[PDB]
Amino acid sequence: SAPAPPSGWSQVFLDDFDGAAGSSVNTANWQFDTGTSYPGGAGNWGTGEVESMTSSTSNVSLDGNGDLLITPRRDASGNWTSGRIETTRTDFQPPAGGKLRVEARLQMPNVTGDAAAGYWPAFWMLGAPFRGNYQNWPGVGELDIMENVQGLNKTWATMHCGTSPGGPCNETSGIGNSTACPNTTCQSGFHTYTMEWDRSVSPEAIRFSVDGVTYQTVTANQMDAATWTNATNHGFFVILNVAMGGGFPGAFGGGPTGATEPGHPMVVDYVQVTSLSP
Ligand SMILES: [Mg+2]
């Protein structure tokens, strides 16, 4: 369960994924992305990933112990399925002068080596104008709070913005970094992945951390005013998924292969949004 926030912070959103084992997610908080694209969006979720997303509890369910499970599955015909859920809410944005923290505590799919090839878990945010549009990436803004591939002991955090390819945000790489999980591997158990959006200073800043340790900071002056405005002057929605294959795993050896093992969930204790007043 989420621990109490620090002094002065208020709760904006919390889903701690409590409920019986094998039961369905709270759809007051979450909506399902299904198939191989948004309705009228880019093919294969824009990444070349090979799974079809579903709303089945074979791919998205609770563990009964306070966690969401998103589990890639491979059927007897060789078809991959997985889960991709987004917050119903799109409003997350601190007021000017304020701060926001968006956080998840999760275990990355516990699989390494050849068996992990293609596994692409993610916990991320997309600018509200993307919803029902699907055609305004990267200008609309993307905050990747945790990404991982290949069961490697590291987390990537990235901001996407501006134009692609290139532009001030160096697309499609984005403004990002990777680091090992502190103390224990990312795959071994829970870690906390946090984005702090700080509108209390000039230049405005976004800081990504793992287990309370900051590894990537992005500041507004890294791009022009219009680019920052387009990327951040709106709410965001939150997304949790495990992609299978596509470009990110492709840059780290590829996958899935015949050796990739299905059935290793991303285990998410909670997603929480908190706010600090100006
Ligand atoms: Mg929980």
Tab-separated table of C-alpha atoms and ligand atoms in Angstrom:
chain	number	residue	atom	x	y	z
A	1	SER	CA	0.000	0.000	0.000
A	2	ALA	CA	0.996	3.618	-0.548
A	3	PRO	CA	2.639	5.179	2.504
A	4	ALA	CA	1.333	8.497	3.830
A	5	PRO	CA	2.681	11.444	1.783
A	6	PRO	CA	5.136	14.022	3.182
A	7	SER	CA	3.879	17.049	5.140
A	8	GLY	CA	1.903	19.521	3.057
A	9	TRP	CA	1.083	17.166	0.171
A	10	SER	CA	-2.529	16.325	-0.624
A	11	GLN	CA	-3.944	13.294	-2.378
A	12	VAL	CA	-5.257	13.888	-5.898
A	13	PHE	CA	-5.573	10.239	-7.020
A	14	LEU	CA	-4.897	6.874	-5.449
A	15	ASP	CA	-5.667	3.404	-6.696
A	16	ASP	CA	-4.022	0.839	-4.464
A	17	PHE	CA	-5.483	-2.138	-6.395
A	18	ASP	CA	-7.073	-3.826	-3.394
A	19	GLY	CA	-9.649	-6.535	-4.053
A	20	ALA	CA	-9.919	-10.287	-4.503
A	21	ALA	CA	-7.416	-12.389	-6.438
A	22	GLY	CA	-8.295	-12.746	-10.117
A	23	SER	CA	-10.848	-9.933	-9.996
A	24	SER	CA	-11.213	-7.070	-12.411
A	25	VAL	CA	-9.672	-3.570	-12.147
A	26	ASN	CA	-11.746	-0.557	-10.952
A	27	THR	CA	-13.099	0.895	-14.182
A	28	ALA	CA	-14.226	4.063	-12.400
A	29	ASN	CA	-10.471	4.797	-12.421
A	30	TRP	CA	-9.210	2.912	-15.485
A	31	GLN	CA	-10.110	2.316	-19.101
A	32	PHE	CA	-8.817	-0.504	-21.288
A	33	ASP	CA	-6.850	-0.067	-24.492
A	34	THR	CA	-7.486	-3.082	-26.718
A	35	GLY	CA	-6.274	-4.635	-29.953
A	36	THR	CA	-3.241	-3.404	-31.839
A	37	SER	CA	-4.015	0.340	-31.876
A	38	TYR	CA	-6.159	3.144	-30.604
A	39	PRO	CA	-9.372	3.459	-32.637
A	40	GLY	CA	-7.938	5.509	-35.499
A	41	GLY	CA	-4.418	5.572	-34.024
A	42	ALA	CA	-1.028	4.401	-35.324
A	43	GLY	CA	-0.646	0.732	-36.232
A	44	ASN	CA	0.806	-1.590	-33.599
A	45	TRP	CA	0.676	1.084	-30.894
A	46	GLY	CA	3.206	3.103	-32.886
A	47	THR	CA	6.147	0.909	-31.846
A	48	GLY	CA	5.985	-2.269	-33.944
A	49	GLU	CA	5.078	-4.274	-30.833
A	50	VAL	CA	3.406	-7.581	-31.645
A	51	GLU	CA	0.773	-8.218	-28.966
A	52	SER	CA	-2.927	-7.537	-29.036
A	53	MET	CA	-4.055	-5.782	-25.834
A	54	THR	CA	-7.136	-7.153	-24.069
A	55	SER	CA	-9.502	-6.494	-21.209
A	56	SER	CA	-9.359	-10.142	-20.087
A	57	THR	CA	-8.258	-11.019	-16.553
A	58	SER	CA	-5.720	-13.297	-18.226
A	59	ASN	CA	-3.885	-10.018	-18.986
A	60	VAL	CA	-5.197	-7.495	-16.410
A	61	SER	CA	-6.264	-8.623	-12.926
A	62	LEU	CA	-5.700	-8.177	-9.195
A	63	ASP	CA	-3.510	-10.534	-7.162
A	64	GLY	CA	-5.612	-10.323	-3.985
A	65	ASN	CA	-2.648	-8.907	-2.072
A	66	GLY	CA	-3.025	-5.256	-3.052
A	67	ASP	CA	-1.539	-5.376	-6.549
A	68	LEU	CA	-2.509	-5.106	-10.170
A	69	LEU	CA	-1.066	-7.808	-12.450
A	70	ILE	CA	-0.441	-7.077	-16.105
A	71	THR	CA	0.580	-10.398	-17.646
A	72	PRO	CA	1.756	-11.073	-21.227
A	73	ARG	CA	0.350	-14.346	-22.574
A	74	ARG	CA	1.243	-16.460	-25.598
A	75	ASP	CA	-1.486	-18.793	-26.825
A	76	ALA	CA	-0.969	-22.196	-28.464
A	77	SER	CA	-1.199	-20.517	-31.882
A	78	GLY	CA	1.741	-18.191	-31.053
A	79	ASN	CA	-0.345	-15.035	-30.527
A	80	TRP	CA	0.776	-12.586	-27.858
A	81	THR	CA	-1.697	-10.705	-25.687
A	82	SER	CA	-1.082	-8.252	-22.868
A	83	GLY	CA	-2.662	-5.357	-20.958
A	84	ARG	CA	-2.663	-1.577	-21.365
A	85	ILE	CA	-4.835	0.528	-19.077
A	86	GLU	CA	-5.217	4.312	-18.810
A	87	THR	CA	-6.737	6.555	-16.189
A	88	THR	CA	-10.243	7.730	-16.963
A	89	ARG	CA	-8.965	11.076	-15.641
A	90	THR	CA	-6.957	13.363	-17.912
A	91	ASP	CA	-6.777	16.371	-15.592
A	92	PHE	CA	-3.490	15.845	-13.688
A	93	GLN	CA	-1.556	19.139	-13.701
A	94	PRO	CA	-0.301	21.258	-10.808
A	95	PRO	CA	-1.262	24.918	-10.812
A	96	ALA	CA	1.458	27.470	-11.486
A	97	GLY	CA	3.550	27.874	-8.345
A	98	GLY	CA	2.586	24.350	-7.277
A	99	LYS	CA	4.047	20.864	-7.601
A	100	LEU	CA	2.671	17.468	-8.605
A	101	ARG	CA	4.013	13.971	-7.973
A	102	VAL	CA	2.889	10.987	-10.031
A	103	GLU	CA	4.095	7.705	-8.569
A	104	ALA	CA	3.768	3.965	-8.911
A	105	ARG	CA	5.227	1.217	-6.778
A	106	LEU	CA	5.807	-1.837	-8.933
A	107	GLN	CA	7.849	-4.941	-9.657
A	108	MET	CA	8.996	-5.293	-13.256
A	109	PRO	CA	8.202	-8.666	-14.855
A	110	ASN	CA	10.462	-11.110	-13.040
A	111	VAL	CA	12.239	-12.705	-15.961
A	112	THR	CA	15.790	-12.290	-17.322
A	113	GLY	CA	17.988	-13.460	-20.201
A	114	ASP	CA	16.635	-15.108	-23.336
A	115	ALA	CA	13.281	-15.713	-21.611
A	116	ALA	CA	12.772	-11.946	-21.158
A	117	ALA	CA	13.426	-10.946	-24.764
A	118	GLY	CA	10.741	-8.509	-25.888
A	119	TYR	CA	9.268	-7.646	-22.465
A	120	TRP	CA	8.574	-3.904	-22.375
A	121	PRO	CA	6.817	-2.781	-19.175
A	122	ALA	CA	5.927	0.905	-18.856
A	123	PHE	CA	4.354	3.423	-16.482
A	124	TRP	CA	3.891	6.733	-18.193
A	125	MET	CA	1.861	9.864	-18.902
A	126	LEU	CA	0.470	11.374	-22.083
A	127	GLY	CA	-0.892	14.901	-22.584
A	128	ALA	CA	-4.685	15.126	-22.405
A	129	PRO	CA	-5.136	16.450	-25.988
A	130	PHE	CA	-3.823	13.102	-27.293
A	131	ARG	CA	-6.986	11.318	-26.165
A	132	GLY	CA	-9.502	11.150	-29.003
A	133	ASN	CA	-6.889	12.599	-31.357
A	134	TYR	CA	-3.923	10.187	-31.428
A	135	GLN	CA	-2.052	12.276	-34.013
A	136	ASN	CA	-0.192	14.890	-31.958
A	137	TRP	CA	2.873	12.991	-30.676
A	138	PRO	CA	5.405	14.132	-29.489
A	139	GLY	CA	4.273	17.770	-29.384
A	140	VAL	CA	1.490	17.010	-26.889
A	141	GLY	CA	4.052	15.771	-24.323
A	142	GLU	CA	4.899	12.352	-22.908
A	143	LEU	CA	6.414	11.667	-19.514
A	144	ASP	CA	7.836	8.170	-19.294
A	145	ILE	CA	8.219	7.579	-15.557
A	146	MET	CA	9.367	3.970	-15.882
A	147	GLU	CA	10.260	1.975	-18.970
A	148	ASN	CA	12.308	-1.195	-19.153
A	149	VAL	CA	13.246	-3.836	-21.693
A	150	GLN	CA	14.722	-7.329	-21.747
A	151	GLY	CA	14.452	-7.946	-17.981
A	152	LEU	CA	17.521	-5.760	-17.487
A	153	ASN	CA	18.211	-4.268	-14.046
A	154	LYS	CA	17.532	-0.670	-14.989
A	155	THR	CA	14.786	1.873	-15.326
A	156	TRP	CA	14.525	4.497	-18.066
A	157	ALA	CA	12.762	7.834	-17.507
A	158	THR	CA	12.180	10.215	-20.385
A	159	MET	CA	10.366	13.323	-21.559
A	160	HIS	CA	9.164	13.461	-25.153
A	161	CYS	CA	8.256	16.796	-26.746
A	162	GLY	CA	8.619	19.101	-29.727
A	163	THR	CA	8.975	17.481	-33.138
A	164	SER	CA	10.188	14.085	-34.348
A	165	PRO	CA	12.697	13.141	-35.524
A	166	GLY	CA	15.101	15.524	-33.777
A	167	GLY	CA	13.914	18.855	-32.406
A	168	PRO	CA	14.810	20.121	-28.927
A	169	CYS	CA	13.800	16.839	-27.322
A	170	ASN	CA	16.120	14.729	-29.524
A	171	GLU	CA	13.310	12.487	-30.764
A	172	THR	CA	12.786	9.611	-30.747
A	173	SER	CA	15.256	9.239	-27.886
A	174	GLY	CA	13.626	12.061	-25.905
A	175	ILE	CA	15.282	13.751	-22.931
A	176	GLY	CA	16.002	10.728	-20.756
A	177	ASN	CA	18.302	8.566	-18.687
A	178	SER	CA	18.569	5.064	-17.260
A	179	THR	CA	19.867	3.794	-13.924
A	180	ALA	CA	19.942	0.531	-11.963
A	181	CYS	CA	17.306	0.069	-9.278
A	182	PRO	CA	18.767	0.877	-5.869
A	183	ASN	CA	19.530	-2.012	-3.466
A	184	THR	CA	17.770	-4.825	-5.307
A	185	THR	CA	17.080	-5.455	-8.996
A	186	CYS	CA	14.016	-3.909	-10.608
A	187	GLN	CA	12.806	-7.455	-11.391
A	188	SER	CA	13.240	-8.877	-7.892
A	189	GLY	CA	10.495	-6.935	-6.104
A	190	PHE	CA	8.892	-3.557	-5.554
A	191	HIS	CA	10.444	-0.215	-6.358
A	192	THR	CA	8.910	3.251	-6.418
A	193	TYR	CA	8.983	5.294	-9.644
A	194	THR	CA	8.168	8.977	-9.320
A	195	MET	CA	7.767	12.048	-11.494
A	196	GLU	CA	7.781	15.437	-9.776
A	197	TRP	CA	6.454	18.298	-11.882
A	198	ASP	CA	7.703	21.516	-10.296
A	199	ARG	CA	6.002	24.767	-11.295
A	200	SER	CA	7.364	26.597	-8.224
A	201	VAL	CA	10.620	27.739	-9.878
A	202	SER	CA	11.816	29.361	-13.088
A	203	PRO	CA	12.738	27.503	-15.170
A	204	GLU	CA	10.014	24.943	-14.482
A	205	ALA	CA	11.359	21.438	-13.959
A	206	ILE	CA	10.336	17.816	-14.159
A	207	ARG	CA	12.336	15.328	-12.054
A	208	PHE	CA	12.253	11.554	-12.398
A	209	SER	CA	13.282	9.333	-9.499
A	210	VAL	CA	13.481	5.703	-8.439
A	211	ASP	CA	13.180	4.807	-4.743
A	212	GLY	CA	13.471	8.506	-3.939
A	213	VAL	CA	16.691	9.035	-5.952
A	214	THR	CA	16.588	11.535	-8.821
A	215	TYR	CA	18.227	10.364	-12.065
A	216	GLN	CA	16.744	12.598	-14.765
A	217	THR	CA	15.755	16.244	-14.662
A	218	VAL	CA	14.218	18.210	-17.523
A	219	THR	CA	13.898	22.006	-17.403
A	220	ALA	CA	11.710	24.335	-19.457
A	221	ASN	CA	14.669	26.237	-20.874
A	222	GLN	CA	15.793	23.096	-22.772
A	223	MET	CA	13.238	24.045	-25.437
A	224	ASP	CA	11.403	27.155	-26.644
A	225	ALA	CA	8.312	28.520	-24.852
A	226	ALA	CA	5.849	27.148	-27.428
A	227	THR	CA	7.345	23.630	-27.235
A	228	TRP	CA	7.130	23.615	-23.412
A	229	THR	CA	3.582	25.026	-23.497
A	230	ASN	CA	2.451	22.424	-26.037
A	231	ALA	CA	4.023	19.640	-23.992
A	232	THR	CA	2.909	20.723	-20.507
A	233	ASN	CA	0.093	23.298	-20.507
A	234	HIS	CA	-2.696	20.778	-19.984
A	235	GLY	CA	-3.596	17.745	-17.920
A	236	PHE	CA	-2.125	14.299	-18.469
A	237	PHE	CA	-3.540	10.806	-18.203
A	238	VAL	CA	-1.551	7.868	-16.774
A	239	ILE	CA	-0.877	4.583	-18.600
A	240	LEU	CA	0.289	1.146	-17.352
A	241	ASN	CA	1.220	-1.583	-19.838
A	242	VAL	CA	3.478	-4.419	-20.792
A	243	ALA	CA	4.281	-4.258	-24.493
A	244	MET	CA	5.824	-7.272	-26.248
A	245	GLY	CA	8.495	-6.490	-28.850
A	246	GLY	CA	8.802	-3.310	-30.873
A	247	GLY	CA	11.470	-0.675	-31.203
A	248	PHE	CA	12.795	-0.354	-27.640
A	249	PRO	CA	13.489	-4.079	-27.192
A	250	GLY	CA	14.740	-3.997	-30.798
A	251	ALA	CA	17.559	-1.670	-29.736
A	252	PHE	CA	18.576	-4.149	-26.993
A	253	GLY	CA	18.656	-7.480	-28.846
A	254	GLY	CA	15.112	-7.839	-30.164
A	255	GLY	CA	12.215	-10.093	-29.257
A	256	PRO	CA	9.974	-11.773	-28.637
A	257	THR	CA	11.600	-15.001	-29.801
A	258	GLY	CA	10.581	-18.651	-29.427
A	259	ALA	CA	12.431	-18.601	-26.107
A	260	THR	CA	10.496	-15.689	-24.584
A	261	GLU	CA	8.470	-16.963	-21.614
A	262	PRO	CA	4.932	-15.650	-21.170
A	263	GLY	CA	3.292	-15.372	-17.769
A	264	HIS	CA	5.567	-12.923	-15.933
A	265	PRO	CA	3.427	-10.035	-14.671
A	266	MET	CA	4.282	-6.463	-13.947
A	267	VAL	CA	3.056	-6.247	-10.348
A	268	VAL	CA	1.738	-2.783	-9.406
A	269	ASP	CA	0.946	-1.973	-5.764
A	270	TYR	CA	-0.442	1.477	-6.507
A	271	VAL	CA	-0.583	4.538	-8.701
A	272	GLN	CA	-0.764	7.823	-6.784
A	273	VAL	CA	-0.964	11.493	-7.700
A	274	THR	CA	-0.251	14.109	-5.021
A	275	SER	CA	-0.164	17.895	-5.065
A	276	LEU	CA	1.711	20.630	-3.227
A	277	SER	CA	0.056	24.075	-3.108
A	278	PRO	CA	1.863	27.219	-4.306
B	1	MG	MG	-1.791	-1.742	-3.536
